[PDB]
Write a protein that binds this ligand. Structure first.
Ligand code: DYK
Ligand code: CL
Length: 300
């Protein structure tokens, strides 16, 4: 296996890194500035994925080919790959910057602090619906491109500066969420998995819809752990036997009703991501018609 440089190659001179954001799968992720990566933008604030100085050539090749999966997507609700610096070292992958980080961390940041200070009220139905439709739009685009996500969860969704939610860069493991997985024999996100995936290990767009339902439950609970009082082994049994997550405290009816459609035991009875969008399109912000996959000419 090798990495072939292409049209995504960017001159290192156009790149500058500043704030370290945190550890990625192959090395440190930094915030920075990239020249000439976005049309009509002389400079753009970007995320820069790097490979640690010590890493082998085999590993930096894998990092490049793995990151390269993102090259085929062009969706407003999917985090964009903007360039690659494969020539010389350090090896860089230039990504769209999502200043508010992953959705699980963003939702947890909205929890009231244990102090006597004023606090912003929990997100409104309208704000939660906006998040749902953006996530469902990114997922509808990914399904239209013949992909199955297999790890749809708030931790794999990212939040932009303007609060837009997008399907995150693939395989960006935040070590803080390692307990959201369970090895049974690969490491799997059992609390987000459909009953049919828990039985045979097969994932489809219908099991992504199931996970989307768990994502809504994460938004309504501010990312509590699904099935909190149950062990990883107990979760498998409960969900395969028809068990469901409870309606969160103060969850608006419409949002729980959407969760219930996603958690129908028979995968064929769940709605598709497009049907999900159709049902909430009237609740979306004006701009949704201009940027979404749902309203684009691509949706045929
Ligand atoms: C200013 O950009 C950010 C601030 C940020 O920090 C948090 C949100 C802001 N508060 C104040 C502090 C906590 C988290 C993420 C980003 N961006 C961003 N974009 C795209 C990809 C990534 C990313 C990919 N793999 C990672 C591993 N580890 C951290 C970040 C990443 N990261
Ligand atoms: Cl769909």
């Amino acid at each position: 296996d090798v990495y072939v440089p292409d049209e995504w190659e960017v001159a290192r001179e156009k790149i500058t890194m500043s704030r370290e954001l945190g550890q990625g799968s192959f090395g440190m992720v930094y915030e920075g500035v990239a020249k000439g990566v976005v049309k009509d933008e002389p400079e753009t604030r970007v995320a820069i994925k790097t490979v640690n100085e010590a890493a082998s050539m085999r590993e930096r090749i894998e990092f490049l080919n793995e990151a390269s999966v993102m090259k085929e997507f062009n969706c407003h609700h999917v985090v964009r790959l903007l360039g690659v610096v494969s020539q010389g070292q350090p090896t860089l992958v230039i990504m769209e910057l999502m200043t508010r980080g992953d959705l699980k961390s963003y939702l947890r940041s909205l929890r009231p602090e244990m102090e006597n200070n004023p606090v912003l009220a929990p997100p409104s139905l309208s704000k939660m619906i906006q998040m749902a439709g953006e996530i469902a739009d990114g997922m509808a685009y990914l399904n239209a491109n013949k992909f199955v996500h297999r790890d749809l969860a708030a931790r794999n969704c990212m939040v932009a500066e303007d609060f837009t939610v997008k399907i995150g860069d693939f395989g960006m493991t935040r070590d803080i969420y390692e307990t959201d997985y369970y090895r049974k024999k690969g490491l799997l996100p059992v609390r987000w998995m459909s009953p049919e995936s828990l039985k045979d290990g097969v994932f489809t767009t219908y099991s992504d819809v199931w996970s989307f339902g768990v994502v809504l439950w994460e938004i309504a609970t501010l990312a509590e752990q699904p099935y909190q009082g149950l062990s990883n082994e107990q979760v498998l049994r409960f969900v395969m036997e028809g068990g469901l997550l409870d309606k969160p405290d103060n969850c608006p009816d419409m949002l729980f009703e959407l969760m219930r459609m996603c958690w129908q035991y028979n995968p064929k009875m769940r709605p598709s991501f497009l049907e999900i969008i159709s049902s909430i399109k009237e609740e979306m912000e004006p701009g949704f018609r201009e940027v979404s996959f749902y309203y684009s000419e691509e949706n045929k």
